[PDB]
Scaffold this active site. Structure first.
Site, PDB file in Angstrom:
ATOM      1  N   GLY A  60      -9.789   6.958  -3.199  1.00 56.93           N
ATOM      2  CA  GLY A  60      -9.787   7.625  -4.506  1.00 56.93           C
ATOM      3  C   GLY A  60      -9.944   8.963  -4.204  1.00 56.93           C
ATOM      4  O   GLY A  60     -11.285   9.167  -3.918  1.00 56.93           O
ATOM      5  N   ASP A 112      -0.524   5.033   0.648  1.00 51.49           N
ATOM      6  CA  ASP A 112      -0.887   6.161   1.931  1.00 51.49           C
ATOM      7  C   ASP A 112      -1.211   5.629   3.028  1.00 51.49           C
ATOM      8  O   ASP A 112      -1.843   4.600   3.486  1.00 51.49           O
ATOM      9  CB  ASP A 112      -2.250   6.808   1.097  1.00 51.49           C
ATOM     10  CG  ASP A 112      -2.021   7.536   0.201  1.00 51.49           C
ATOM     11  OD1 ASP A 112      -1.071   8.293  -0.220  1.00 51.49           O
ATOM     12  OD2 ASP A 112      -2.840   7.430  -0.856  1.00 51.49           O
ATOM     13  N   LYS A 116      -5.856  19.299  -7.639  1.00 51.53           N
ATOM     14  CA  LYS A 116      -5.393  18.952  -6.408  1.00 51.53           C
ATOM     15  C   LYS A 116      -4.172  17.908  -6.170  1.00 51.53           C
ATOM     16  O   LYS A 116      -3.334  18.111  -5.594  1.00 51.53           O
ATOM     17  CB  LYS A 116      -6.611  18.256  -5.498  1.00 51.53           C
ATOM     18  CG  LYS A 116      -6.210  17.562  -4.177  1.00 51.53           C
ATOM     19  CD  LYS A 116      -5.775  16.171  -4.440  1.00 51.53           C
ATOM     20  CE  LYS A 116      -5.146  15.601  -2.973  1.00 51.53           C
ATOM     21  NZ  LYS A 116      -4.915  13.961  -3.295  1.00 51.53           N
ATOM     22  N   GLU A 170     -13.657   9.857  -6.267  1.00 53.09           N
ATOM     23  CA  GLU A 170     -14.562   9.371  -5.382  1.00 53.09           C
ATOM     24  C   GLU A 170     -14.672   9.996  -3.957  1.00 53.09           C
ATOM     25  O   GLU A 170     -16.103  10.203  -3.797  1.00 53.09           O
ATOM     26  CB  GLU A 170     -14.219   7.588  -5.223  1.00 53.09           C
ATOM     27  CG  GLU A 170     -14.074   6.950  -6.630  1.00 53.09           C
ATOM     28  CD  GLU A 170     -12.784   7.002  -7.238  1.00 53.09           C
ATOM     29  OE1 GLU A 170     -11.741   7.918  -6.815  1.00 53.09           O
ATOM     30  OE2 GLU A 170     -12.533   6.209  -8.134  1.00 53.09           O
ATOM     31  N   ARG A 171     -13.849  10.501  -3.437  1.00 52.00           N
ATOM     32  CA  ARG A 171     -14.161  11.118  -2.306  1.00 52.00           C
ATOM     33  C   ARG A 171     -14.779  12.659  -2.438  1.00 52.00           C
ATOM     34  O   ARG A 171     -15.467  12.811  -1.603  1.00 52.00           O
ATOM     35  CB  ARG A 171     -12.711  11.186  -1.433  1.00 52.00           C
ATOM     36  CG  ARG A 171     -12.552  11.929  -0.180  1.00 52.00           C
ATOM     37  CD  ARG A 171     -11.402  12.072   0.467  1.00 52.00           C
ATOM     38  NE  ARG A 171     -11.010  10.453   0.603  1.00 52.00           N
ATOM     39  CZ  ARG A 171      -9.831  10.101   0.346  1.00 52.00           C
ATOM     40  NH1 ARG A 171      -8.726  10.863   0.296  1.00 52.00           N
ATOM     41  NH2 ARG A 171      -9.521   8.782   0.086  1.00 52.00           N
ATOM     42  N   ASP A 201       0.695  -1.141   0.156  1.00 52.69           N
ATOM     43  CA  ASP A 201       0.138   0.081   0.029  1.00 52.69           C
ATOM     44  C   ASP A 201       0.875   1.195  -0.094  1.00 52.69           C
ATOM     45  O   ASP A 201       2.120   1.347   0.440  1.00 52.69           O
ATOM     46  CB  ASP A 201      -0.952  -0.232   1.232  1.00 52.69           C
ATOM     47  CG  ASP A 201      -1.823   1.133   1.544  1.00 52.69           C
ATOM     48  OD1 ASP A 201      -2.434   1.531   0.374  1.00 52.69           O
ATOM     49  OD2 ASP A 201      -1.760   1.882   2.398  1.00 52.69           O
ATOM     50  N   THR A 259      -4.791   2.922  -4.194  1.00 48.41           N
ATOM     51  CA  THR A 259      -5.917   3.681  -4.766  1.00 48.41           C
ATOM     52  C   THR A 259      -5.637   5.040  -5.152  1.00 48.41           C
ATOM     53  O   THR A 259      -6.306   5.820  -5.753  1.00 48.41           O
ATOM     54  CB  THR A 259      -7.025   3.902  -3.686  1.00 48.41           C
ATOM     55  OG1 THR A 259      -6.531   4.594  -2.741  1.00 48.41           O
ATOM     56  CG2 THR A 259      -7.601   2.609  -3.206  1.00 48.41           C
TER      57      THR A 259
HETATM   58 CL   LIG Z   1      -5.898  10.255  -5.573  1.00 47.82          CL
HETATM   59 MG   LIG Z   2      -3.316   3.181   2.872  1.00 43.54          MG
END
Ligand SMILES: [Cl-]
Ligand SMILES: [Mg+2]
Length: 225
Positions: free
Chosen positions: A50, A10, A78, A53-54, A8, A116
């Site tokens: 994402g 983040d 962003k 999506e957020r 992963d 993601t």
């Molecule tokens: Cl992103």
């Molecule tokens: Mg994460």
């Protein structure tokens, strides 16, 4: 005895989410909208993976300004801001991550990202934190919109495993969140979790190990069993 490690990004490679939150809020201000995500609201919004999506989720219910651009354009702006913030050099890898990757490379173990986040963000993190383009660190990069359904769907892990050409029983994932754990487990992977600020409240049933720090892994053998 592991043939691949899937990371992963983040909250796993690095604590990035406060920087993402800053990039969102600065983008919103630059766009002239009244939107502002405090930590309390961002912790909820983080359950949708994402960035596009957020934003979409936030826009479904919020009572402030209407969106003045398409979501994809908001997200692009962003992303550009996050990339610039990352290049300032203030983000570090989480403890243990650099040591594990170096040990893995000495052992000939192939490495993937399964994330993601959008691809430019991976590249920015690797330039700042590893001092290389991403493709010199990771053999496989599975990111962003490479799949239709983001974590907790396993699809991004299934993509990475196909590209690695390693069966899941011979691989392992490192994650920080429940959505991530679920995605890894759905792809048949053992999964080591170490939470962080925004995920510490979550429950991690079925994690193969749950660690306060990836520095507690204890080397490649800590990935076995
Ligand atoms: Cl992103
Ligand atoms: Mg994460």
């Amino acid at each position: 005895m592991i043939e691949a490690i899937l990371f992963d990004v983040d909250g796993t490679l690095a604590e990035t989410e406060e920087l993402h939150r800053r990039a969102f809020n600065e983008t919103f201000a630059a766009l002239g909208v009244d939107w502002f995500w405090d930590r309390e609201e961002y912790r909820e919004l983080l359950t949708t993976t994402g960035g596009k999506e957020r934003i979409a989720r936030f826009l479904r219910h919020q009572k402030g300004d209407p969106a003045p651009l398409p979501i994809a354009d908001i997200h692009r702006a962003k992303t550009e801001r996050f990339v610039a913030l990352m290049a300032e050099g203030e983000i570090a890898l989480r403890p243990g991550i650099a040591d594990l990757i170096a040990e893995a490379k000495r052992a000939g173990i192939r490495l993937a990202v399964a994330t993601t986040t959008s691809l430019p963000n991976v590249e920015a993190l690797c330039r700042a934190c590893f001092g290389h383009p991403a493709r010199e660190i990771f053999d496989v990069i599975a990111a962003g919109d490479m799949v239709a359904e983001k974590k907790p769907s396993p699809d991004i892990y299934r993509l990475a495993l196909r590209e690695l050409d390693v069966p899941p029983e011979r691989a392992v994932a490192l994650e920080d969140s429940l959505n991530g754990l679920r995605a890894a487990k759905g792809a048949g992977l053992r999964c080591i979790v170490s939470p962080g600020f925004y995920t510490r409240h979550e429950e991690f049933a079925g994690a193969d190990r749950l660690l306060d720090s990836f520095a507690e892994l204890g080397g490649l053998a800590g990935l076995d069993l």
